[PDB]
Each structure stands twice: as structure tokens, then as C-alpha cells.
Amino acid sequence: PKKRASNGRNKKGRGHVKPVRCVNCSKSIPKDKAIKRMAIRNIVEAAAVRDLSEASVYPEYALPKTYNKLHYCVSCAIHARIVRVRSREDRKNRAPP
Amino acid sequence: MRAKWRKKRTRRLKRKRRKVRARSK
Amino acid sequence: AVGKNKRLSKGKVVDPFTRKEWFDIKAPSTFENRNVGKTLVNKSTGLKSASDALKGRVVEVCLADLQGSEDHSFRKIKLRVDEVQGKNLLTNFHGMDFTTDKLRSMVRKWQTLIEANVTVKTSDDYVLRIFAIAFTRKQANQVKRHSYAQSSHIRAIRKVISEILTKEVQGSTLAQLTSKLIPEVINKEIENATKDIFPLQNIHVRKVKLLKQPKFDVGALMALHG
Amino acid sequence: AMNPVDHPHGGGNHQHIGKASTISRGAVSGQKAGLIAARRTGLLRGSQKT
Amino acid sequence: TPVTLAKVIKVLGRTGSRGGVTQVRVEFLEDTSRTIVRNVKGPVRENDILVLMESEREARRLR
Amino acid sequence: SQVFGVARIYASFNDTFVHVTDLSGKETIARVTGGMKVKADRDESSPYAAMLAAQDVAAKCKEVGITAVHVKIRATGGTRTKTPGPGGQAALRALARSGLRIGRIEDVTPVPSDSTRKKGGRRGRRL
RNA sequence: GGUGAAAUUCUUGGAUUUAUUGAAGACUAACUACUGCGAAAGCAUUUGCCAAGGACGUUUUCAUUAAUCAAGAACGAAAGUUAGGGGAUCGAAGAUGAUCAGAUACCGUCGUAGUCUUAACCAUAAACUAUGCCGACUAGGGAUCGGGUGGUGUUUUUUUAAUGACCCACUCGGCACCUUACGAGAAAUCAAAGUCUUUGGGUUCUGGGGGGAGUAUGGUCGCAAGGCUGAAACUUAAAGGAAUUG
Numbered sequence: 001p002k003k004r005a006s007n008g009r010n011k012k013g014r015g016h017v018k019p020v021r022c023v024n025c026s027k028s029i030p031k032d033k034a035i036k037r038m039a040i041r042n043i044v045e046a047a048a049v050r051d052l053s054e055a056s057v058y059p060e061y062a063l064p065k066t067y068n069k070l071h072y073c074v075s076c077a078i079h080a081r082i083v084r085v086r087s088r089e090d091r092k093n094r095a096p097p
Numbered sequence: 098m099r100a101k102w103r104k105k106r107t108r109r110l111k112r113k114r115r116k117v118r119a120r121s122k
Numbered sequence: 123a124v125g126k127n128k129r130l131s132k133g134k135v136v137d138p139f140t141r142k143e144w145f146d147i148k149a150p151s152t153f154e155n156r157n158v159g160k161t162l163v164n165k166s167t168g169l170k171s172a173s174d175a176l177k178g179r180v181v182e183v184c185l186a187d188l189q190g191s192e193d194h195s196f197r198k199i200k201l202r203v204d205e206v207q208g209k210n211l212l213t214n215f216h217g218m219d220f221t222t223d224k225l226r227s228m229v230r231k232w233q234t235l236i237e238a239n240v241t242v243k244t245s246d247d248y249v250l251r252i253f254a255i256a257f258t259r260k261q262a263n264q265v266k267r268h269s270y271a272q273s274s275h276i277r278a279i280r281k282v283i284s285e286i287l288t289k290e291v292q293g294s295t296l297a298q299l300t301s302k303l304i305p306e307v308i309n310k311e312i313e314n315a316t317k318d319i320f321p322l323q324n325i326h327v328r329k330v331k332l333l334k335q336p337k338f339d340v341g342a343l344m345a346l347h348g
Numbered sequence: 349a350m351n352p353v354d355h356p357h358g359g360g361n362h363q364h365i366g367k368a369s370t371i372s373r374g375a376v377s378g379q380k381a382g383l384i385a386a387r388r389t390g391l392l393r394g395s396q397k398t
Numbered sequence: 399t400p401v402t403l404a405k406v407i408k409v410l411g412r413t414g415s416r417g418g419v420t421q422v423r424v425e426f427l428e429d430t431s432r433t434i435v436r437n438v439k440g441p442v443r444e445n446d447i448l449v450l451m452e453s454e455r456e457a458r459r460l461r
Numbered sequence: 462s463q464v465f466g467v468a469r470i471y472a473s474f475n476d477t478f479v480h481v482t483d484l485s486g487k488e489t490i491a492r493v494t495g496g497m498k499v500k501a502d503r504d505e506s507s508p509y510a511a512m513l514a515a516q517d518v519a520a521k522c523k524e525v526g527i528t529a530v531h532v533k534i535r536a537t538g539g540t541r542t543k544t545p546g547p548g549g550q551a552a553l554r555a556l557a558r559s560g561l562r563i564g565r566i567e568d569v570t571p572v573p574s575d576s577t578r579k580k581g582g583r584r585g586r587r588l
Numbered sequence: 589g590g591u592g593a594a595a596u597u598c599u600u601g602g603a604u605u606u607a608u609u610g611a612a613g614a615c616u617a618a619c620u621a622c623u624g625c626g627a628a629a630g631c632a633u634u635u636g637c638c639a640a641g642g643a644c645g646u647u648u649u650c651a652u653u654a655a656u657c658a659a660g661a662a663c664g665a666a667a668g669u670u671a672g673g674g675g676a677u678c679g680a681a682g683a684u685g686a687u688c689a690g691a692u693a694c695c696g697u698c699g700u701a702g703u704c705u706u707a708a709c710c711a712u713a714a715a716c717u718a719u720g721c722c723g724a725c726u727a728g729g730g731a732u733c734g735g736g737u738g739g740u741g742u743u744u745u746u747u748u749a750a751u752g753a754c755c756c757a758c759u760c761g762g763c764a765c766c767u768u769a770c771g772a773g774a775a776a777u778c779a780a781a782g783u784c785u786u787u788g789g790g791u792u793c794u795g796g797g798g799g800g801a802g803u804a805u806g807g808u809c810g811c812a813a814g815g816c817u818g819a820a821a822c823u824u825a826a827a828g829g830a831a832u833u834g
Contacts, residue, residue: 012717066226159464266732475589
């Protein structure tokens with residue numbers, strides 16, 4: 001049967017969507033169907049922050065971060081525990097916590 | 098078997114029919 | 123891998139630190155920190171002419187470094203090695219660029235990006251390709267989430283931007299460009315042109331590439347470095 | 349198809365060359381029948397590569 | 399053999415695939431307030447001194 | 462006052478390369494990598510090896526005379542993983558605790574617009 | 589350098605690498621969404637030109653000209669073919685690293701055809717929303733794209749005009765959505781998959797247990813690959829759909 005109403009993607013009034021590649025497997029998957037997330041991560045990872053602050057040529061340094069979108073396939077996503085499988089009643093929470 | 102490969106087997110068989118019947122005709 | 127290599131030399135010392143000499147590079151008149159840095163180069167034998175072998179270079183340094191200003195932090199200037207006078211060598215403009223972290227911060231969805239490009243000549247014989255980035259924004263008193271434009275607004279924004287670019291650069295020489303881009307008055311010119319179109323925040327500038335300069339004119343460079 | 353007097357391939361009860369047709373550049377006038385100063389032969393598949 | 403004597407001030411939790419090891423937060427005594435988070439094998443508790451043959455490591459996890 | 466170099470890190474999976482140079486770049490100093498530090502072909506990417514190289518190049522740069530460095534982080538990008546290995550954090554922690562001074566950290570990973578082609582088949586890498 | 593780990597391979601002839609240029613081709617990230625357009629396939633830099641289109645507004649015009657359709661024609665992803673070009677990445681085949689009991693399969697390094705394009709062919713796809721086209725009526729709610737109306741509404745230049753961008757309300761048309769379940773259905777589920785045993789608004793196309801078989805033959809189209817049309821004999825009691833517990 002139709003397991004979903006949108007078939008695991010978002011295609012209405014298109015008929016076609018240009019593809020996207022994953023990053024582990026690099027599988028050609030569409031965009032509306034993908035597991036796009038967003039990595040916004042301080043470059044320093046919260047451990048070396050004290051050392052870099054004290055050793056900075058300039059204090060009051062912003063200490064910028066990596067900003068980038070992360071497209072994942074269903075397989076590698078589920079395997080890397082990004083998402084996980086959901087009950088037949090809670091598949092429909094289209095928003096996150 | 099898988100339907101696609103069943104199709105491929107059928108096609109190869111079919112074109113072989115083609116060739117043999119060309120040989121006889 | 124410390125001990126894996128099957129051959130370091132299929133073909134079958136002096137310390138380069140001692141073989142290298144120091145040099146000290148200064149900015150032009152358009153930036154308050156003239157003295158900006160140093161560099162190294164092998165000792166100028168008659169075989170090599172370290173002067174020219176070093177002349178063929180460029181350096182990116184931050185405008186916060188050159189003006190003390192963390193608001194100017196997000197812009198970097200490439201300054202070309204153009205003159206050398208006995209280890210107090212001098213530069214001139216080569217090209218601007220933002221920081222990718224800044225760009226990746228300002229880019230976000232539920233808004234509309236706009237980008238324009240122009241490939242225009244200046245008053246002083248250079249020919250430069252400048253770009254311009256502008257964003258949309260939810261108005262105050264607005265309630266919608268995205269504030270998407272309607273593409274005719276965008277094409278018009280493109281036209282007015284590009285003609286502003288040509289107008290300015292056609293008449294402003296190189297140093298004048300630097301002097302009016304360090305404050306970025308151009309962005310406020312855009313916003314004052316367009317505030318009857320869209321609120322239009324985050325209207326910064328984008329890279330600029332000398333496509334062909336005139337002759338060096340060491341006299342002009344020294345005039346800058348008076 | 350000629351006779352061996354008339355060419356360096358001619359002759360034989362079968363039309364066959366016998367001796368390889370890739371000829372040195374430093375051959376002479378009388379031997380330079382065939383593929384001369386050749387680096388490779390056969391069907392080329394790909395690119396002139398220049 | 400210059401080593402550093404540093405004290406576990408917190409235990410993060412057990413790891414190894416077999417519960418055989420743990421992760422702990424340890425403060426250097428020399429150069430106080432210099433924290434680290436590192437691994438231990440044996441039975442250990444709070445406040446516990448320990449010699450470390452280096453300072454500059456933090457192994458996140460293990461199986 | 463303080464003399465400045467630039468750090469030029471490239472934190473690829475399977476290896477975190479570091480090298481330091483003049484502000485221009487052609488004046489290159491002391492390129493070192495994880496595999497230059499350690500043995501295991503898998504540990505080429507080890508952050509341990511990364512910090513090892515960081516301290517060794519710190520020794521080289523202190524004994525040649527640099528004081529500060531402006532950091533330029535890079536990753537594979539282009540077609541490939543686009544995200545750093547652990548040696549990034551490892552090396553910056555290492556030089557921070559080594560004491561050489563720090564400025565102007567920036568990411569220059571090639572994040573190309575409208576790339577050529579992503580490798581590894583359409584179906585993917587069937588690991 | 590690659591990996592789960594390794595290995596094939598490149599590195600004093602300086603790889604890998606960093607800086608300044610260059611060339612070739614492809615590509616049009618981020619903005620990019622329960623968002624748009626298009627009959628469908630499909631379409632993502634700018635600018636210019638070519639004609640086109642839907643909706644909207646209309647106290648304009650003609651006047652029943654219309655719907656759906658065999659036959660019959662147009663377009664028709666990828667792959668593939670023909671001759672030229674182009675020819676970077678990627679990569680059917682194939683060689684090799686290996687792992688394996690075996691592995692011409694996965695993973696790895698190479699890599700021709702191809703990938704791109706001009707002219708001409710092919711006429712298929714899970715070409716799926718597996719849901720024909722026209723029309724009407726019926727439960728709510730909200731959000732959104734486009735047009736329009738009204739509202740001293742707000743913000744915008746020169747305080748202030750326009751305009752524009754917002755807010756509110758309404759409206760027509762669109763991509764869809766949240767909830768119910770009156771209704772329906774075998775159930776999943778569905779604002780139609782409803783208004784059907786209280787059986788009829790109009791029309792077209794297809795199916796009649798499973799396989800054989802989308803086979804055979806005959807035409808017909810195509811250079812070919814193959815496509816369109818398309819049975820029978822024989823065999824069989826089940827295959828199959830949706831849900832429940834294990």
C-alpha cells in the first residue's frame with residue numbers, strides 16, 4: 001500500500017526534481033526526498049577554546065564557525081543514526097522537537 | 098526470476114529465433 | 123606511514139633559513155597601517171633576481187588588520203607586490219574578498235537573495251569585475267515568514283545596482299574606489315535608491331578582479347607611497 | 349599480390365606479408381614499403397591526445 | 399620521564415564495548431584549572447590522583 | 462611588532478595536512494602530515510598525529526623565528542567530503558598550548574557552485 | 589594515496605602540497621520551500637531579441653460556436669543507434685589490487701563506448717499522484733502563489749504626493765495542507781477514492797482466476813536495437829490485496 005501520503009519526498013506540481021548526491025554513499029537522490037540537515041559547528045569543538053583565547057593575537061575574537069548544509073541519503077542517514085524509524089502514528093510529526 | 102531478466106532472456110531467445118529463421122529463409 | 127616508502131629517490135646541505143633573507147611589506151596611502159608585514163626569500167644571487175622573483179606575488183590581509191576595526195573584520199584585501207625599495211617594499215591593490223564564514227552566516231532561507239555582476243572600466247585604465255549581494259527581509263509590521271520577492275523587483279534592483287556601479291567606477295580612480303569601499307557608502311546608496319521597492323537589508327559588496335592594468339608606473343606607486 | 353621481385357610483400361602460396369610491415373626510419377630506398385617510423389598500429393580508440 | 403600528576407574530579411561514564419574502561423574529567427594540579435577528559439582502565443573514584451605520561455590528549459570514545 | 466605567518470591546514474579524511482608559510486605563501490615552511498608523524502595507514506588521519514606535527518612545526522617555526530600565524534582551514538570539498546577531519550581541532554589545540562600566537566581563522570574549503578560530477582556511481586558506494 | 593583494515597599506483601626525475609596565471613569541457617550549489625510555470629516529458633546566472641500563455645479586471649465583441657473521443661497527427665526523461673564535432677570529470681565493458689571456499693559481484697586504482705552538442709532516428713520508463721477528461725452539490729479551520737477591490741491602516745523618499753513593501757478584510761483562480769467522518773470502502777485509508785442495491789449527469793479507454801505470454805504467427809514502423817497490434821495449445825486451485833496476533 002501507500003506507506004505515506006507524499007511518498008517520502010515533496011513533489012507537487014513538478015513531475016521532476018533535479019537530483020542530489022549523498023556524502024557517504026554519494027547516491028543520486030532527489031532534493032525534496034533527501035535528508036538535508038544543517039551543520040553549524042564551531043571550528044574549535046569547545047575543547048581548545050581556552051587555549052586559543054589566551055593565545056590569540058587579538059582578544060575579544062569572534063572565533064567563527066563552519067556553516068554548511070548536509071544532504072544525506074535515507075540509508076546512510078538511518079545507519080549514521082541521524083534519523084531513526086518511527087511508529088505508524090508518529091511518522092506524521094512533520095516538525096522536530 | 099526477476100521480471101526484467103526474464104525479459105532479457107526472452108529477448109535474446111527471440112532474436113536468436115530471428116537469426117535461425119533468416120538462415121533457413 | 124613513517125617507514126612505508128619503497129623508494130624516496132628513483133633518481134638513483136645548507137640551511138635554507140640561512141639561505142633566505144627577510145623583507146618588509148607596506149600598504150598604500152589608502153590604508154592607515156602602511157607597515158603590514160614581512161616575508162622571506164632566498165638571497166638574491168645574480169642568477170635569480172630575488173627582486174622580481176618576489177615581485178611576482180600577492181598577499182591577502184584583513185581590513186581589521188589594516189584599520190584596527192573589527193567591523194571591517196569581514197573584508198580581506200589582496201595587495202600585490204608591485205615595488206621593492208631595499209626591504210621596505212611597497213604594494214598596490216589587487217582584489218577584495220569576503221570571508222566564507224560571513225557569507226555562510228548571512229545566507230539563510232525564508233528570504234530572497236539577489237546578486238549582480240558588472241565588468242566595468244575605471245577612470246584610471248584598469249578594468250575590474252565587481253559583484254554585489256543584497257538580501258530581502260521581513261518588514262516591521264509584517265507577519266509572513268519568508269518575504270519572497272516577485273522577480274521584477276529583482277531585475278529592476280539588478281539594473282539600478284549595475285548602473286550605480288558603472289557610474290561610480292567611471293570617474294573614481296583606484297584609490298578613490300578603495301576610499302569609498304572601506305566605509306561602503308555604496309550600500310546605503312542602494313538602500314536609499316530602493317527603499318520605495320523593498321526594505322532590502324544586508325547589501326554588501328562582492329569580489330572584484332583586475333582583468334588588465336595599465337603599465338606599472340613606478341612613479342605613480344611612489345606618489346602613493348610618498 | 350605482386351611477386352617478391354616486384355615488392356617486399358609479394359609471393360607465397362598464400363597472400364601474406366610474412367615479415368612485419370613496421371619499418372625503421374633508417375631503412376633505405378627499396379625497403380620503405382609499409383608503415384614507416386611508426387609508433388603504434390591498429391585501431392586507435394580515444395584521442396589524438398595533444 | 400617528565401610526567402604530569404593530575405586528579406580525576408569527575409567521572410563521565412563507562413566505555414569499552416565490555417564496560418572495562420571509563421571516561422573521566424581530570425584537572426592538572428601543576429598549572430591548575432587546566433582540565434582534560436581522558437580514559438582509565440582500573441577501579442577509580444572521585445578526588446583521585448593519577449600520574450599521566452602526557453597532557454595533550456582526549457580520546458572521545460572506544461568500543 | 463610580532464611577525465606573522467599563515468597556517469594553511471587541509472583536514473581531509475585519511476590525512477590532516479598542515480603547513481605554514483609567509484603571508485604571500487610562496488615562502489613555504491615545514492610541511493608535515495600525520496603519516497609523516499606515525500605508522501598506521503589508518504592512523505594517517507589520527508588527531509594524535511596531527512598534534513604531533515603541530516608541535517614539530519611549532520619547534521621549526523619558533524627556531525626560525527615566527528611569533529604568530531593567521532589560520533586558513535581547508536577541507537577536501539569540490540566533489541569530496543567537504544567536512545574536516547579531527548586533525549583540524551587537534552592541530553589548533555596543539556599550537557594553542559604550544560604558545561604560538563593566533564589570528565584570523567577562516568575556512569576556504571572549495572564549496573563549488575555547480576560542480577562537475579560526484580564520483581562513486583549513481584547507486585552509491587555499496588559498502 | 590586509498591580502505592573496515594590493506595593492497596594495486598605516484599613520489600631526489602620532488603610527488604602530495606602552497607602562491608600567480610592559463611587552457612578544455614561540464615555544471616547553474618547555498619537562496620531552494622507541503623513555493624512557481626508547463627499538455628506531459630521537463631524547466632534554476634545575467635542581459636538582449638522572438639513570438640506565446642493562464643489567472644485576474646472588464647456594464648467590450650460573436651453567439652451556442654461546446655465536452656469526450658476510435659481513426660488519424662504533434663511532443664515525448666535516460667539508455668541506444670548514423671556521420672561529424674567536442675571530449676575535462678564521471679564511467680556500461682575490460683585489465684588489475686584485493687576480500688572470499690570460489691568472486692570476471694560488492695570496496696579500490698586505471699580506464700574505451702558513452703556522458704556534451706549540431707543534423708537525422710528510436711517512441712519506451714514505477715513516462716506514478718500506480719488515482720482519465722468535462723460539469724455540479726455537499727463539513728469545518730488555517731496557511732500560501734498570482735491578479736483584483738476596500739480599508740485616514742502601518743513603513744518608505746522631499747516629515748509628508750504618488751508609486752512601492754507591509755497589515756486587516758474580502759474576492760477569483762492555482763501547488764497543497766490540518767481535523768473530522770456525515771458519507772464511502774474489503775481494509776489501508778479518501779474533500780473525494782463522496783452525492784452507488786434508496787443502484788442512470790456526459791463521454792473515452794481498459795480488465796474477467798493464475799501461468800503459458802505480452803509468447804507464436806501475420807501485418808506494420810524503425811538502419812538496427814526493438815516498438816504497435818497480438819492469440820492458441822497445454823497446465824493449474826489457488827495466485828493475489830489489506831489488516832491482526834505471533
